[model samples]
Target chain A: HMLIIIGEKINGTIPSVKKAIEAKDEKLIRDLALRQEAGADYIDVCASTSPELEVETLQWLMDIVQEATDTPLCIDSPNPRAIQQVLLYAKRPGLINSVSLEGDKCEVIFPLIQGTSWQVIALTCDNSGIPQDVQSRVEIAQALVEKAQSYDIAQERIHIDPLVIALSADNGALLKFAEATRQIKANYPMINVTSGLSNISFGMPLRKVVNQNFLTLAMFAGMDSAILDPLNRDLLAALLATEALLGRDKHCRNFANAYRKNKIGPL
Target chain B: GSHMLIIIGEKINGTIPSVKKAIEAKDEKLIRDLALRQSEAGADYIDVCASTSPELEVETLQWLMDIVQEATDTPLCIDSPNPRAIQQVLLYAKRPGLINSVSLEGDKCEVIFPLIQGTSWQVIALTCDNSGIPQDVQSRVEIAQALVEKAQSYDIAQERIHIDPLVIALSADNGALLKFAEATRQIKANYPMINVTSGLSNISFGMPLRKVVNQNFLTLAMFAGMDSAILDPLNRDLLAALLATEALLGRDKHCRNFANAYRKNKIGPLK
Candidate 1:
């Protein structure tokens, strides 16, 4: 049963999306709000703008998203310091995008929300980069959990992302992700496994076709959260249907309720 | 600390032939062989029952008790429908042991409660009454309440009571196991000190793969708060299931004992 969706929009990767990212346009921000309100449990505010202006862009995006809707903002940025820069402007406590063992990440980020109710996504990678093998990934995850525990952050507060890689590059990508999810769950039964929606489908044709399949596979592998484009009707439909089939949605009420209210596609 | 199967070797009954033959012929080997084999198979208790004519029930039980006592120091489970049979045999028992039962029915409490009242003897309590076996969780719970109340009157603590919530046959009702689990949960919720016990065999009376069904039933029952059972403790595979289920539920610390048991062949594989 995958949990709460965090709509992964606001990144400067697409042409129009980058235009929206650079223009700091209120209309694009408002449209994202409407899409997020439709079903997303969280709205990610990523500022993939130039590194020189990332912090300022993230602050601007955060201000617009917060003002437009009360949906909690997931302060997304590759730079931990940039996320820390605008952390104060968040309207409420929400999920922290991520931290890995690249350097002093667990050290720097863990103390920020010591007594607060904020949860975090911790990736299972370190200075040597993501491991392709399951055992090494699990060992890295264990290191993250141990480091987090050193900060007194409970296992429940930490969602371990095994960092699912692209399948087109490596055929064992999906299998490795599943193995990592299984091994991590066996060790820390409480900690959740989360992943980005498009990570596995990066180089694949009909990306959503691959992405949706990845979502289902990840969910069955005990993935409880996703950083996904919740606005994609087909992906959203697949998510809702998968959740229902897995018995997470009680009596298909959520599926029915989402459809009846037009939160999803054609009734 | 040794991983011995506390076999509570559930034989020695009027329903069983060799035991009856042993009683009629005074042949001790039948009872002795069962005790020996069960012990060889790692039984911790060669449970002795003298299911016989009430006129000679105690004498018969005493005779069986003496034979087992002389045969081996293996602990006894003095089993009888009548609690006095157990009480009468208690003095004859060479060691402190388990009492087969006391129910909410009649003076079962009045008879045996005071006898083992202050002793190290543990007792099995059926979740039934004079009105007979309850068909619902509510009635079974009511019986549990009544039995606990009476035990309290005798100053018998709950930990002394192994509450056997008598799982009805699954063939009779699909919900039989669920109801037992519910009752066990209710009882344990209120009194966590009490030991929830059951006989898993009853659940698979008419079912295929009785062993598999029985093992699964034990697994679920244990998950639902059952701590003990009137089971064939010598059944290594069933023990393996119990250990495996416990480890899977995260009750077994680091699954150390599960691994050790498998390695020692106490749970998995035959020697």
Candidate 2:
């Protein structure tokens, strides 16, 4: 399958987006959702706000993005209750930004979307937090997959994010990511592998270069979903290139079409 | 080490204007500087292509090769379309190096292989022949097979050969990258130990912002098992992409080479 890019521009952690969320800037959120939909499969809306404002802020952003385009929303929040409060605001079954073994996250989110077309991003972490080794990460991925299945969620409804550490913290971060991806897919081929594209290069200089390269490698390692800014043409070009190189592009039609359509390159 | 791409520095070739000017002016310093700079940039072999007239080919190549050898420890890829020109200058190399190419065309393989055999020297075997470069994968694969057949006839080791699948332009053929990658995968499947290499430029012909297409080609081609490339090591972004690719392929352990390159100012944005 082609990459399912969850447009990450609308997330509030980014400086401009944080300003937009704090200012209640509907126009900025709407435009991001629209433009991202032009190239993304889902527009992710994260309200990185105070605990008091998290639910309302997520709901507010969701309304703007939903109103702007038919592209579904990836309802994002670290707090399951915040996501739970805004779930119905999405209008359609989009993706659940995440769930991990930390507390009742899976218990809350899995049963909410059971038997629905909704997809969920499962991070490979438990109460002890994101594991440091490949074995623990893979084990968490298996556990996450099994938990979703108990709720009647098929394997394809899940996207597992390994939550890769920064290369500066551990140079083997990408290596671990690939191994975990391979092992997870080997265990359950129907499940999808995903990650936030920029996390691997968190402390690196010229992070865009590192990030783009990470996208290519991750795609090679069988990553089918990525939370990234689809509006960034350079990253888009890299993704398209990886897609065709992986031989997923029939006749390289998509790569050529992207070039002719100016979805990539200096337009 | 395993995923590390073998980069043959391509800047000293006479095709580019500045290098052409240096070649015409017999600018020793300019050519020497390029050789040293490319070596410092981590080129495994400095490609010396004398894009000069056939009559002057041997002398021009020898001159470029001599300058490159004098400037750095990196070996030379003796590049010339005419096999004999490469033959005439083969002995000038102080140690084992790459023979720019041989093919199914005319006597290219018949002449170059015997000379490189019983030695530590290697070669670039283009997937073309008597008729011309076959545009289809089957034909290209067949020519590649024939090239290997011819190389073995001369007692050449497959391990000492680099097969170039000769990627066409993306603008002319949308499937150029696909075919090249497919051809590479098939070729590697047949000869697992053999190296796959290509020049970075040809695939971007007739395209705007050629570097964009070229960089994309490099990334996928590597993923397709292209382990060697003829490229300008001085181009910071391309080199950065190449290193990043090696790491992603699980070639760079601990990403040491990648991080160290950044620290040494060998890659990254223009400072």
Candidate 3:
């Protein structure tokens, strides 16, 4: 009923995770999966490995995460072929870590999830890469939506990653995101908008402050999903507050119950 | 209150240990200095409450108001549990200011409303009856409806009133902040011109490292359409968060207030 968190802890780009992936540490991977499961709706699994081993590595990671927790897997890859091969390993339908108008992305993946409940995160990118301006990003998103409709997928199943540039990267970053979010929702009312929290905080002093406020402002602009670290206590408190302020948390039952159980708030 | 958000400085209150000592010592220096700081730090109002002695409450209240008004042009939020105490010290304020509250309990409105009826003065109206603070949103909203109804009977405009859902500690009731917000939602919907407000402390009672929980509550409260709060504007980090929050909420689109605060050294690594 709230932001659909795609737990991004299992990616191999992280120093600890890269070492674990190198060591094939099932223990580390399983702990990561469970840690995120408690706070995330879907635990993302990205091997971040070589093209050849990508499928098997993702398969191995998915198997361990599947047996470890009921939290579904968000299969991620730069190559659609890798994500396509590992699709069957997931125990149930979950989010696909995304597609763009690049190459055969939508053609290969959308057909597979056509009749299923699996959702996909769509980036506002084409072969030229992520568009810089608001209109371009939104137009890219519109194209993604049109392509999804071609495969009989509804707009509700698509999470548009508007790809917010950092506040450091662009002074107009939040404004761009706000405008893009509004336009995307207006065009496709059921479209699910999403992003990672870190991109907006990059190159900023006191990144945490920027990040927390970004989550609040972004939600107000219609962002309903985020790829972030669920283990971040301060950020989690901020997220809970934003939901309550937006009047999304009924009686703030989720906020209060989370606090009572020592799941949120100060330690 | 600003169209974006309002801040009521909560220092100079006698319940705080240092403030209590200052009050007992009749120390005008501390109250006067703190009032200037809150005003410079962007507080829209300075809330002066003498929580120590009921016998000397009005005298203490008058002293606090005199020092604050002399220090800054920011208006006062004259705070006290006693309606009569607020009434007694009301004339001390040099300008039209906020009456710390009125509720459905015991002729509180009867005492305060007619005094400021057609004037520019504002009031913080709590959503509680003789039953005390209602635990449920419906009852709370009902109380707010009655407060609005009563205020209208006195020719008090809706905008002059602030609906305080009287949030309790999250530890005492899991949905305390929720109830406040939910009640505010219905109240704002029912009466479009009214404002919602609260104190920053009560929501985090019984919680560890309460500062984090308190700031979290502030962001949500503002988001829920809370027009103001009884808060410490001198807390730089909290002040930063509020400005950032205002920017994020799109009131300051270019983050002019947020960035200017940084340049003016109002927030971030203050010297």
Candidate 4:
């Protein structure tokens, strides 16, 4: 009924996480996994290592995360082959980081998750790179969804990330994201619309503030899920409050419970 | 874009501990500072509520009004639960400002409406009656319809009235904010020009870290067609949140107001 947060803190691209991966810090990864598990629906693991070690690094992360918690893993990697190698390591079905019309990404990933309960996050981009306009993004979403259909993948199993641009670069980035989400949801009512929450505020001062507001506005415009840092108290508060405001959190029980449990708000 | 958001600064009220201390001490410096700071922070109206005993209410309000008027030119929103107290000091307001409120509770509407009739003064009308604030949206909307009709009888035009649906505490009624939004939408549909407003803090009563809850409530209420609000204009984070919401709603063209606020150090990180 509300946002399904794919916690994005485990990616190796972050400086501390990169250091942790190089040092083989299982303790660090375990702590991050448990913290995200406390607030997220899925723990997104992205091994942003060199291509040679991408698969091995992802497998290492999957093992540590699985040993740490029962939360499902959202196996993330830019290369479909890398995701393909690590897919077997996962103990349970969870979200696939993405597929797009870019190269054979859709061709590679769709077939693997097909006929399984596993879900996927599909990007609205192609081999030409990320689209600057809403129409092209929607077109890519259409193509990706159609391709998934051939692989016997139901629309509901695919989550479409519209890949929001930075607001500093394009003031209308949010407007376009909202439009794409609306049109995509309208076209495939069962398909989930998602986004990488922090991307909307890249290059802005006080990024967390901007990101929090963007999440609220996006949910109002029909965004179904997001990949973000679930441990961010402010962002979590905004998400819970937005759901309650939209009448999706019946009687606001979830928001109240979050407050009661000390998961959000000032300590 | 048709109408800018109206922020009624709520810091000078007696219910707040600091303000209450200032009232008890008769500290003109504290009252004046609040009035001036709120004015500088972009308050459209400074609300001064004297939550004192009935016998002391009128005198306290007069003293507060004089200090605020001397401190800033920003109009005052004279607030008092007792309509008689508001009536007593109605003329003390030097310029056209809003009446803190009126409702179907007892003779509140009867006492407050005719006093501001045929003038440019606006009024904040609560959607409640002698039975107290309603627990449901329909009842609140019905109360609004009655209040609007009562104002009309006093020759008070719809545009001059601000309907506050009296947002119930969220902890008590989980649907409090939703009900507020629904009531706002219904009221606006009935009279588009009527301004909808609310006291931002009341919705967060009984909650820990009330400021965050209050800020989020303001965002949702504004999106729901609430054109004005009673809140602290000087709470930089809350002010920033409000401006951001306005830009997202397309009410701030080119994000000018939002950008200007940042540049002026009125929002975002303080310099």
- Measured by TM-score, the strongest candidate is 4
TM-score, candidate 1, chain B alone? 0.86
Residue-wise lDDT of candidate 2 within B15-54, one digit each (tens)? 8999989999999999999999999988999889889889
Query: Candidate 2 deviates by what RMSD?
Result: 2.9
TM-score of every candidate relative to the true structure: 0.51, 0.90, 0.78, 0.91
DockQ head-to-head 1 vs 3, winner: 3
**Ranked candidates, highest DockQ first:** 2, 4, 3, 1
Ranking by lDDT: 4, 2, 3, 1
Off by over 4 Å in 1: A1-267, B1-7, B36-44, B249-271
Which DockQ-derived CAPRI band holds candidate 3? incorrect
Q: Could you give candidate 3's per-residue lDDT for residues A1-267 as a string of tens digits?
A: 588888888998998998998887999988988888347999998898888888888988999899789988899888888888989988899999899998999999999899999999999988998786999999999899988998899999999998888665566787789899999999988889999888876754556787887887677668989998888877887787666555577666676677888777557
The numbered model that scores best in DockQ is 2
DockQ of 4: 0.34
* Ranking 1 against 2 by DockQ, winner: 2
What's the lDDT for candidate 1? 0.74
Q: On a 0 to 100 scale, what is the lDDT of residue A9 in model 2?
A: 87
lDDT at position A69, candidate 1: 82
Model 3 per-residue lDDT at B102: 94
DockQ of each: 0.02, 0.35, 0.22, 0.34
